[PDB]
A paper describes a structure:
The enzyme is significantly more active against substrates in which the xylose decorated with GlcA/MeGlcA is flanked by one or more xylose residues. The third domain, a five-helical bundle, and the C-terminal β-sandwich domain make inter-chain contacts leading to protein dimerization.
The center of the cleft, which may accommodate the xylan backbone, abuts onto a deep pocket that likely comprises the active site. The sugar was found to be in its ring open conformation, which is highly unusual for hexaose aldehyde sugars. It is possible that the specific interactions between the uronic acid and the enzyme encourage GlcA to adopt an open chain conformation after glycosidic bond cleavage. The direct interactions between GlcA and the enzyme are as follows: O3 makes a polar contact with Nϵ-1 of Trp-249. O6A and O6B of the uronic acid carboxylate form polar contacts with the OH of Tyr-420 and Nϵ-2 of His-422, respectively, the endocyclic oxygen interacts with the N of Val-426, and O1 makes a hydrogen bond with Asp-206. Unlike the vast majority of glycoside hydrolases, the active site of BoAgu115A does not make typical parallel stacking interactions between the planar faces of aromatic residues and the sugar ring, although edge on edge apolar interactions between the sugar and two aromatic residues, Trp-249 and Tyr-420, and the aliphatic side chain of Val-426 were evident. Indeed, in the BoAgu115A-GlcA structure the loop that contains Asp-332 (Met-327 to Asn-346) was too disordered to be modeled, whereas Glu-375 could not be built past the β-carbon.
Residue numbers in the entry:
A (entry chain B): 32 to 329, 341 to 381, 384 to 853
B (entry chain A): 32 to 327, 340 to 854
Amino acid sequence: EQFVIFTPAGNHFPLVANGVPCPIYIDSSEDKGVMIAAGNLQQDILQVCGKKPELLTSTSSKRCIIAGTYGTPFIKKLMSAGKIDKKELDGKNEKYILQVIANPCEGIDEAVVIIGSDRRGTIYGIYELSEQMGVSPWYWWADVPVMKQANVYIKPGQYSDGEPAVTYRGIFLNDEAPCLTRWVKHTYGTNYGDHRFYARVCELILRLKGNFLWPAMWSWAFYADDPQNSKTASEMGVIIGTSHHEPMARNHQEWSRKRKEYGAWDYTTNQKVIDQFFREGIERMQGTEDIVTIGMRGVKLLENVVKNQRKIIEEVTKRPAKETPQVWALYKEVLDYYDMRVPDDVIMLLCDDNWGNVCRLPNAKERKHPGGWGMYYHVDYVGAPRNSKWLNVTPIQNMWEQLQLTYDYGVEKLWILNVGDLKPMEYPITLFMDMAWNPKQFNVSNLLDHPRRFCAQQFGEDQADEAMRILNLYSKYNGRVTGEMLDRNTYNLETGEWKQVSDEYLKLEAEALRQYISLKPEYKDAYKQLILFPVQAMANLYEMYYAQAMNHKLYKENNPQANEWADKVEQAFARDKALSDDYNNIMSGGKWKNMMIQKHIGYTSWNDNFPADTLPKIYRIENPEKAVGGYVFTGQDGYIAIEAEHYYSAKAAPDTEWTVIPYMGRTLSGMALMPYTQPTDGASISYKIKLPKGIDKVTVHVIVKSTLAFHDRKGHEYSIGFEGGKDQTINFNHNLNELPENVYSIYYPTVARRIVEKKAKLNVPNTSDGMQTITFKPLDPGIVLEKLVVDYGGYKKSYLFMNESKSKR
Amino acid sequence: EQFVIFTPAGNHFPLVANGVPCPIYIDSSEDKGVMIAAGNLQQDILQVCGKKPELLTSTSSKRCIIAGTYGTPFIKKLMSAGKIDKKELDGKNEKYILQVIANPCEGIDEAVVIIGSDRRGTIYGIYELSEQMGVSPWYWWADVPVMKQANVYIKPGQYSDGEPAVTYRGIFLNDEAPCLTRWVKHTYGTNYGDHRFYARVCELILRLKGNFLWPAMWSWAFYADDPQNSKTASEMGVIIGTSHHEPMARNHQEWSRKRKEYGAWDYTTNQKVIDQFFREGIERMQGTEDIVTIGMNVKLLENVVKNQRKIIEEVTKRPAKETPQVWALYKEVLDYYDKGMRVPDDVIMLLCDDNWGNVCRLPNAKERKHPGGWGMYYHVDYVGAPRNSKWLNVTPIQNMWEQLQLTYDYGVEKLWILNVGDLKPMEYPITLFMDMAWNPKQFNVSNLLDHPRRFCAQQFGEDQADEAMRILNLYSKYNGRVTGEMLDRNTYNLETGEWKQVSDEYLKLEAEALRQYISLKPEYKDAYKQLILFPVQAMANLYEMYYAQAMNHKLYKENNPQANEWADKVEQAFARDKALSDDYNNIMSGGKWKNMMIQKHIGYTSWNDNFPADTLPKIYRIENPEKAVGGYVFTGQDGYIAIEAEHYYSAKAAPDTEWTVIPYMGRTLSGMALMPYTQPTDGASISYKIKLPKGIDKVTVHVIVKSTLAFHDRKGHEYSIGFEGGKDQTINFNHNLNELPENVYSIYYPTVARRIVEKKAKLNVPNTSDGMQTITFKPLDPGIVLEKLVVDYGGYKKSYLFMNESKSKRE
Ligand SMILES: O=C[C@H](O)[C@@H](O)[C@H](O)[C@H](O)C(=O)O
């Protein structure tokens, strides 16, 4: 695989040495596609080493790069210069051989030689070299830097990716408004995708070793909007197709724009016009490799359409229909129809369910279909049950798992990926393309090596593992539920599931942020696009909805903590906006402005009908300073853990106030009678609980601050007991001193941990009462009550004394 | 309070206008301390505006700053001219008045005037002006940037911090090796703390408005190592003391270093030498404001004190009461005092916290009349039982406040001295401590957090204050739970999710600190790292290390090869701990703080750091983890059994297929699928062994498979699920997952978007003699990916992740 190294070494070809690149020889007979690729190679080398290689007029230099395409005597001489068997490329599809060859031809001492079995092979060779020299396919589309190199040497040996397993390997730009469309407008000034735009797309497809494109078709018409569109793709070597409901090489919008003139999209009543519309599509794609969509939705009718479309193809081409590549999509009713006559030569394009699951795969008879089978796969969708157009939400595993299946069932003629706006599907696109190239090189053991190599490529070797880990995780997390379908109820609040997934995503963000700040500066934009932004956007969205669910829970409980969670919803909502603003406007100098504007907060339907991202509903407790006391707890799972601030009522001693010390202690806060200069006589603080009826004993754990015996050598006491029962008086610190028996056995162990936990076994006075009241009475000043746990079988020893039990006030 | 503003305004004094600072006049009569402070003021102004104010030779400039100290004739003349009453300062302690004054003296049209009741007051005035112009006390000690200003104006009015509530307000550099000691050696090129180092310390103390210092005494001797030490402190205006075990103004090391000559630290047998050692301490500190530690059976201790005070009188030719003295009551001594030990009236009785921020003893109402007053020695760093805390700040904001307010309310107001360890990273507690000692009654529970908020505003700017304060408060609280040294895999409860909770929560805090960090203007990054980010990251990571270690041990005991991942995480976090500290030491602030963050903190088995180095916590790895598959047995708890599909007991593949784990596949752990999908599944099964309570006769089993569709056969995919000893229930999980009108919107699209298919099967539990059940999943069609099973017998709660996996072990 890896033939480029970045240090000089003997019997290694010096492609760049001491900053100086060798020149490039392309024979002038080569297709313009090869030339375009060679030109990009030149530029890539310039990016790599700082000097532009010369494009040689003739076979004259000691060391150079030679690229060309099988079928030429120049290339024959070169293949027997040396020792490359014709059978390595003869009749092969989209294959290159890359090899350092000594004395390749008279006037050249040594060359790295790239020979394609056809022009795309040659292109793929060229781009393989470009890629291995450190120009990612994503150098432009995700601002992946080209690491500068003084030296670039090529290993001896013969290098090939072989032939692609899947014949046509493509993306479909779709769901393209508003992001791609406004981005294109912003970047190119055009209210359509013009050839400058499609030149970038096509360069990307080819660098990814794809060869196929369904252009954007919502409001654009690839063939019609810019007469250079087709020529650009075609000369670069990208095969163009149309989506499954765009027959006969016409873009949907060519009809829609002239609907009043064309009239009805109905074959039974408007056939002459539709046939002619069709005919013109075929005429226009003659001379190209484009694949012709057949069929039509306005069974004997559909066959007649297809019969007629194929006649039209024959009339236009003066060739049998079989010689024009065709695809018939088995998209909906049509699949039912098929379960109908389809000619042998036609690619039967099967569809996923729009969510990455294949619906139908051919059986063993079906697989004998000479035209082959296709798969149209989604990583972006607008439709039921809800649009997924925001972030990548395709788990790496799921794409792999269904594509391996797809290939194993003999679907190998055509793979086409709905990529939405292209960004931010950069990774799945790459996986898709690599899998279409060679699905059998992938198995469960090595799957993650793919995102690993991708991350090595995008962010460097030293970042690959950790970036891959995060890429894999965010893809998984996002697979769970799309941002659009995520809301306050997706996850279970009461079980801790929501907190778990929210905390987990934030942990992933922390990690992504560590990685981000560790990057060399030139990787930051790519990492932001490919890793950090999706992670932060989703982690924050999670927290928003998590905080919302908490807000609602606590609001129903009349607990003024609801207000904090409301703040968090507002903050996260604002953060969502700041994150996208940064992606659009700041990142990459605003190169991707409008690529990240998809509405995602406010869906009440499958479609994003609603105007804009909108604040999830939250509630606030008015006068939260007064919303204190009145807490009643319901025991669950055998215990009641009570944060001391959640008292039912309290009564202060004279010249004192029960005071909440927020954050005090290990958990929520502390309650203390203040000031400490006053006796506490008659103060108490009471907690109301609901035990299951019948529980007759509890062990109450009382957690106070590790206050020491500062006022009175006897130490501090409080009493704890049920209303209606006997109060136990506990002296919680009389042993917290330096006396030999105490100093190591209890004193130092205790004080370093800042709390004192005392247990009181209490008899429940009447086990028939609905509520019990536990009352804490500080008998000495300076006692800070932090927590109580009423254990009736379920308490598990916990440093935080367990999650607070259910309550409401 | 705030008298500096940063725009021009009428009736406001232009201290800096147009980038140009007005000059400074200090009368020649002023103490050198004031001069030193005025010199720093000059520098500070230079930092702020870019131009160094002139130190005027004489009272000749239209506008200038004038600072001086009550009692000089120059200041006398100045106050009896518009319009400052003598009573505002006469006899006041460490007070300033700062006031714009018109025609303050012959030759000056207008001045901002700072008048201290004494030289420290003046100094504090000066530094108040520095601070309000934007020079934090932490400008050097935590690299807090000085926001440049073209214009700095002073509000009219009279400004004062009053008198400090607590007379002596100090820090104790302690536990100082290896960090402070090596940092000093590295920075000052000395093997001891010299006067240049102590000048920085003293500058910090004075800018914080403290006045007191117990210098580092482990391997250094402040008085002896550099003869300029004492002079420097003394002339700056910092009072020097020694720690409670260093009587009579001798540093402990002065004894230790001459222990052969000396020799026994025993008053009963080596009194002549010890008395002389003492006498020399008192001779040496004459001329200074230093406070003399006294003390050293009860009759013996009284005799020592009697003799120390005779020595003080002999040396000073004055009554002992005129020499400030402090006698620490900890341990036996406190009992002696209770038991009835006579302490002379003039002595400051220094009470001690428990080394962990809790006061041990406060004076009662009678005791509080002690004329010498009372002291509190408070710790935010400690080397001792039960275990050293000398790594990070671990003092919750609330705790320092809560005990210090108590301390003050009980009339302990002569002397507050804070053990600060290496000083860094206790920057915040030190500030809180100093501000509280200044004025404890300024603080209450309702405004407490405004203190760290102002601190964060000051250090990181206004726009960062709230969020930095929030993190500061939280990390301080989190650290208060348990010290890094005392934290280990057993601190938190693993089984309840507590460990995960606190680990995840700290990492969330780090995420937040990181957001904040990367939002900062670049000049704040070093200070924020020192003050917020590093402690947060260091602790969050430490938490994860120990959390991962606990998980490792749990899973290892279960013979579950997942243990290995957790082991990786322990190694990684261990390595991260090192990277974090390396950055603090070497990269942050250009390596200014090299060696300040080298404390050992991973490896404690006992109270002291007497182990060679931070060391990898013990982890265990399952050898041959690819073979450590199957053999899982689950124990139901809480009314359900949630089973990740990979955790099967046994499996049998169909011919030419292999049960294959697809890691990460699905919503939780992974997926199990018979591969490849080109083969019929005839006879394949995968079985899970569970322990139900024997009373259970029916369960609803939720079977979670990937939303695979009917790709091979229009009938769709089936599997069977059932108990060994019971009937296998066949479920067709996707026959309805198609575009047929009945299905397309009701079930098809709602299902596939969520990537899974959950089917419930009510199963009867067959009666087994073992109490064990085996539940068996049989894919009858290719391409089925089993992800999870939940066996619900009353406890299942509908959950998107189908609830935390139940307890299991294998083999
Ligand atoms: O914790 C402090 C160090 O262990 C000692 O040098 C110190 O002298 C004593 O333990 C103290 O804390 O005052």
